[PDB]
Amino acid sequence: NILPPGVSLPSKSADVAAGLHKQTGVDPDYITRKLTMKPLVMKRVSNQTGKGKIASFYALVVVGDKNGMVGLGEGKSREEMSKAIFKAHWDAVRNL
Amino acid sequence: PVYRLPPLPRLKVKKPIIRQEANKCLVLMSNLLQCWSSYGHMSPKCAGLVTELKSCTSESALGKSNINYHAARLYDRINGKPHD
Amino acid sequence: MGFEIIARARQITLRPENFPDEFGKIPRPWNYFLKVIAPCPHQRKCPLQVGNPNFYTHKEGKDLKFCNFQKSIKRPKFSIELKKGKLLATSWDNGRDYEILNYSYLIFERSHKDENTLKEIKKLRNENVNGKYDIGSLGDDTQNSWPRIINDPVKRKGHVMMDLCAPSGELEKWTVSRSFSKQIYHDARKSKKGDLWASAAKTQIKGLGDLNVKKFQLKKEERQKARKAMESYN
Amino acid sequence: MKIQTNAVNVLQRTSAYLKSGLLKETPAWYNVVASIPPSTKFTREPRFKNPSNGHIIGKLVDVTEQ
RNA sequence: CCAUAUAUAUAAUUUUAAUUAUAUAUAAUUUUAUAUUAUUUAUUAAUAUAAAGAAAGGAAUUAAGACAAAUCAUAAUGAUCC
Numbered sequence: 148n149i150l151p152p153g154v155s156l157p158s159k160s161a162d163v164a165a166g167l168h169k170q171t172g173v174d175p176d177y178i179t180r181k182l183t184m185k186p187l188v189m190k191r192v193s194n195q196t197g198k199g200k201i202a203s204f205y206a207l208v209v210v211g212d213k214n215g216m217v218g219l220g221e222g223k224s225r226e227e228m229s230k231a232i233f234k235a236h237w238d239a240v241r242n243l
Numbered sequence: 244p245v246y247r248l249p250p251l252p253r254l255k256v257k258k259p260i261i262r263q264e265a266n267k268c269l270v271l272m273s274n275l276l277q278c279w280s281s282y283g284h285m286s287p288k289c290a291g292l293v294t295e296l297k298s299c300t301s302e303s304a305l306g307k308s309n310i311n312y313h314a315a316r317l318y319d320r321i322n323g324k325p326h327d
Numbered sequence: 328m329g330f331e332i333i334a335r336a337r338q339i340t341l342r343p344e345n346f347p348d349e350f351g352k353i354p355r356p357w358n359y360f361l362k363v364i365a366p367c368p369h370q371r372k373c374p375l376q377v378g379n380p381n382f383y384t385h386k387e388g389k390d391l392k393f394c395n396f397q398k399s400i401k402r403p404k405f406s407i408e409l410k411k412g413k414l415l416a417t418s419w420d421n422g423r424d425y426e427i428l429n430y431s432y433l434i435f436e437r438s439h440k441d442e443n444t445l446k447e448i449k450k451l452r453n454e455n456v457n458g459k460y461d462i463g464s465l466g467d468d469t470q471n472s473w474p475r476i477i478n479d480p481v482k483r484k485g486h487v488m489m490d491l492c493a494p495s496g497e498l499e500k501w502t503v504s505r506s507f508s509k510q511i512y513h514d515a516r517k518s519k520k521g522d523l524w525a526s527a528a529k530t531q532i533k534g535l536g537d538l539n540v541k542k543f544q545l546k547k548e549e550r551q552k553a554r555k556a557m558e559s560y561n
Numbered sequence: 562m563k564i565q566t567n568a569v570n571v572l573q574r575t576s577a578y579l580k581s582g583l584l585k586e587t588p589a590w591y592n593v594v595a596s597i598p599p600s601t602k603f604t605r606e607p608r609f610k611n612p613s614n615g616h617i618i619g620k621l622v623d624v625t626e627q
Numbered sequence: 628c629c630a631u632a633u634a635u636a637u638a639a640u641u642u643u644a645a646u647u648a649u650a651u652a653u654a655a656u657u658u659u660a661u662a663u664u665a666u667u668u669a670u671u672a673a674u675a676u677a678a679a680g681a682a683a684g685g686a687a688u689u690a691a692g693a694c695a696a697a698u699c700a701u702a703a704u705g706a707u708c709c
C-alpha cells in the first residue's frame with residue numbers, strides 16, 4: 148500500500164465528542180455515554196440573493212445528562228439537515 | 244461655540260485639496276512673454292529670462308493628501324463617544 | 328412589433344373567429360365589407376401571430392418567426408454621402424450601393440354597394456361549401472388564393488423547398504423536384520420570397536415555423552414541501 | 562456596560578463541569594482561585610470626607626445650629 | 628518555459644559553422660550607498676548621483692455568466708425528407 152503518513156484506511160455523537168475534546172478539552176466519554184440530544188425545531192430558512200433563493204437548514208437542539216446540566220445549540224447548513232443537526236449538537240455541548 | 248457631531252459612519256473629506264506646486268517653466272514663460280509685451284520682441288532687456296527659459300524647458304517642456312487616512316485612523320479615538 | 332401591428336389590424340377587420348370553417352376570400356362585414364388582397368392568401372387566423380411583441384425579446388421566443396418582406400433599393404448620392412464616418416459608417420458596438428429594407432404590410436379592398444353585391448356575398452357565404460382547403464391546396468388557383476412565399480426558398484440540385492403561408496390558413500412546406508416535373512421545378516428554382524407560388528408540388532407537409540408559438544401556488548407548494556421534508560428527516 | 566457575571570464565577574462553572582464529569586482533569590488554577598476568591602460586589606460606595614482638605618461630606622447644618 | 632549571460636559535458640575541430648552544435652546546471656522578480664523631495668518619519672517611496680551586475684524582453688497556465696455560430700469544414704444524437 149501507499150498510505151500517506153497521517154492517513155487511515157476507509158457515530159455522529161462520537162465525532163462531536165472527539166472534535167469538542169480537541170477544541171475545548173471536554174471529556175469525550177461523558178459526551179458519548181451520558182448526554183441525550185433532542186431536536187427542538189428544524190426549519191428551512193432562505194435568503195434572497197441576486198442569483199436566486201439560497202435555502203438553509205436550521206436546527207435547534209437541546210442536550211443534557213438529566214442531572215442538572217443542559218445546553219441549547221443552534222446549527223445551520225446549506226447542504227443537509229444532518230450537518231445542521233451535527234452543528235447544533237456541537238453548539239449545545241459547548242453551551243452546557 | 245463648540246458644535247459636537249453625532250456618531251458618524253465615517254470621517255472623510257470628499258475632495259481633499261493638495262499642494263499643487265506651480266511649474267517653474269510656465270512662470271518663466273509668462274515672465275518672458277510679459278517682458279516681450281512691454282519692452283518689445285527679441286528685446287535684450289530680458290535675454291536672461293530667455294536663457295533661463297531655454298535652460299529649464301530644454302529636456303522637458305514642463306520641467307496627494309493624507310487627511311482621510313489619519314481621520315479614519317483617529318476618528319474612534321477623538322470623537323468623544325461615551326463608553327459602551 | 329410591426330408584424331404584430333399588421334396581425335392585429337388584420338384580426339380586428341376580419342374577425343377570423345367569427346367565421347370558422349369559412350375558407351377562401353369573401354368580403355367580410357366589419358352594408359360594409361372588406362377583403363384581404365395581399366400578402367395574405369386567406370382570411371383565417373394568421374399562423375405566425377403571438378399576441379404580445381415582448382415575447383420576441385425573451386430567451387424562449389428567440390426562435391419565433393414574424394411575417395415581413397424584403398426589398399433592395401439603390402442608394403442615391405445623398406444617402407451614400409450621409410452614412411460616412413464614426414457616426415454612421417462604423418460599428419457602434421465593403422459598403423453597398425443599395426439598402427435592403429424590411430417591412431410588413433397589409434392591403435384591403437372595400438366592396439362596392441349594390442343589391443347585387445350584397446346578396447352575392449350572402450349567397451356565397453351561405454351555399455358555397457368551398458370545402459376544407461387541406462394542406463397542399465392552391466385554393467381558387469387564382470391570384471387571390473395562391474400560396475405566399477414567406478421565406479427564402481432553399482434550392483438544391485433537383486429540389487426546391489418553400490415555406491408558404493397557404494390558402495388553407497396554415498403554414499406549409501412544399502418541395503418541388505425535377506423528377507416530379509421539369510417545368511414546375513424550373514419555375515421553383517427562380518421563385519423568391521414575397522412571390523405567390525401558383526403551381527403544385529410533390530411533397531406538401533406542415534411547416535415547423537410555428538413550432539415555438541403554441542407554447543406561449545407553486546410558492547405555497549415549496550413552503551409546504553419544505554416543512555414536510557424537514558419534519559420527515561426526523 | 563452590564564455588570565458581567567461570567568468573569569468572576571469561572572470557578573463555579575468549572576466546578577459544575579468537574580462535578581458533572583464534562584471535564585476530567587482539574588485545571589492548575591482551580592485550587593488557587595478557590596483559595597483566593599474574587600471580589601464580586603461591584604457596588605458604588607459613598608464617601609463622607611474629602612481626603613485632601615478634611616471637609617466633611619454629607620452633613621446638613623440645622624436651623625438650631627444657626 | 629522561451630530568450631539572454633555564464634559553468635560542465637560531448638565533438639579524435641574534414642558533416643567545421645569550436646565565432647558552432649545541444650544536453651545538464653546557475654543567474655535577477657536585481658542589489659548596495661548617499662543627497663533632495665515628500666511620507667503613515669524609515670528599516671518608506673520617487674528622483675538624482677555614485678557602486679556591483681550581461682541582465683534589457685516575451686509566452687503559457689482557472690473558472691462563471693452573456694450573446695453569436697449549421698463552410699458547426701468545432702461534432703454527436705435525434706427529428707424530417709429523397
Ligand code: SF4
Pocket residue numbers: 333334366367368372373374375376394475477492
Ligand atoms: S401572409 Fe400569412 S403569415 Fe403573413 S400576415 Fe398574412 S396570414 Fe400572417
